[PDB]
Ligand binder design. Structure first.
Ligand SMILES: Nc1nccc(-c2cccnc2)n1
Length: 321
């Protein structure tokens, strides 16, 4: 099938987004950064290692559900088009593409992400593995370009890995409302959500003893150093995984070991870290089964299927427009 890539992000979209977030984030109290910047080449390779850590259950848990329920997803949604809010690189991507193809229904694939070079590689890869599927990759962001996702056919939107968990309730509901807005009656959404559980298990999942997640978090300081001429003493910042009991969410912090004076060159900004000051780099909200259905209902979608893994660690929702 023919490959297409439509690019809606300017060449300096990423850099200009990084200046904004760093300028604003390092002047908040407490200092905070979007989890958007962990993923340069190094961080992406670190995340790949994280998914194979025994402590990080979500990847395997979601995969377990998908290995069992992918056929039912295909037959219940009846989609001919797979829209992935992601890079299209996971084996989970293929599991759903196989399930739709097995029904003789796989007609189009739409990967949607911000890295045009990632989408181009995904599209070439799906093109050799799935004869007869048109691949329409869309380079855009959630805030502006959900409308640029092609229309027509019966579309199954996919958003896995409890990545919606990286949005706080306010921004999370806006995203779901906007996503439901571009969905057509008959379209469906498959959404993965990590579930609330034993706190010690959750903290361990975000601070493996080998420190891969620690390096992954500290990697954000190198990215700021390299891209905006900052002088973060990366080794003087400790990764700290916190369980927020009141908000029921995991929080990734970076703790300054001693007073730090950090100058971000490209921004003409100097910020100060008190000794023991912590900066928030990510939130990872954990969900309750009932609450996910209410959130989809609040945005205008109707959950028709809910699945957990065998241990009840992770949940998958199939909601219809
Ligand atoms: N996308 C996503 N969703 C949930 C958790 C995570 C995550 C972050 C940082 C380290 N390990 C896992 N990423």
């Amino acid at each position: 099938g023919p490959v297409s890539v439509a690019n809606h992000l300017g060449e300096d979209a990423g850099h200009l987004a990084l200046r904004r977030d760093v300028y604003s984030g390092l002047q908040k109290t407490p200092k905070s950064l979007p989890p958007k910047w962990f993923y340069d080449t190094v961080g992406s390779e670190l995340f790949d290692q994280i998914t194979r850590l025994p402590e990080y259950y979500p990847t395997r848990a979601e995969a377990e559900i998908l290995r069992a329920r992918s056929a039912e997803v295909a037959s219940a949604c009846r989609a001919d088009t797979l829209v992935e809010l992601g890079s299209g690189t996971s084996e989970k991507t293929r599991m759903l593409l196989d399930a739709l193809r097995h029904r003789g229904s796989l007609r189009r694939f739409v990967p949607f992400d911000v890295d045009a070079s990632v989408l181009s590689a995904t599209a070439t890869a799906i093109q050799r593995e799935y004869s007869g599927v048109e691949i329409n990759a869309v380079c855009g962001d959630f805030e502006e370009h959900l409308t640029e996702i092609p229309r027509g056919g019966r579309r199954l939107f996919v958003f896995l890995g409890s990545t919606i968990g990286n949005l706080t309730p306010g921004p999370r509901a806006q995203f779901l409302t906007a996503l439901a807005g571009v969905m057509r009656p008959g379209d469906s959404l498959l959404l993965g959500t990590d579930l609330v559980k034993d706190a010690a298990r959750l903290v361990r999942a975000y601070d493996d003893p080998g420190g891969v997640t620690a390096q992954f978090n500290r990697n954000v300081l190198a990215v700021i150093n390299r891209e905006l001429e900052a002088d973060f003493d990366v080794d003087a910042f400790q990764h700290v995984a916190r369980w927020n009991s009141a908000e029921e969410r995991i929080e990734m912090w970076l703790r300054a070991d001693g007073r730090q004076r950090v100058r971000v060159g490209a921004l003409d900004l100097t910020v100060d870290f008190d000794a023991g000051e912590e900066m928030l780099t990510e939130v990872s909200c954990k969900f309750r089964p009932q609450a996910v259905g209410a959130e989809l209902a609040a945005a205008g979608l109707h959950r028709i299927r809910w699945w957990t893994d065998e241990a009840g660690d992770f949940g998958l929702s199939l909601a219809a427009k």
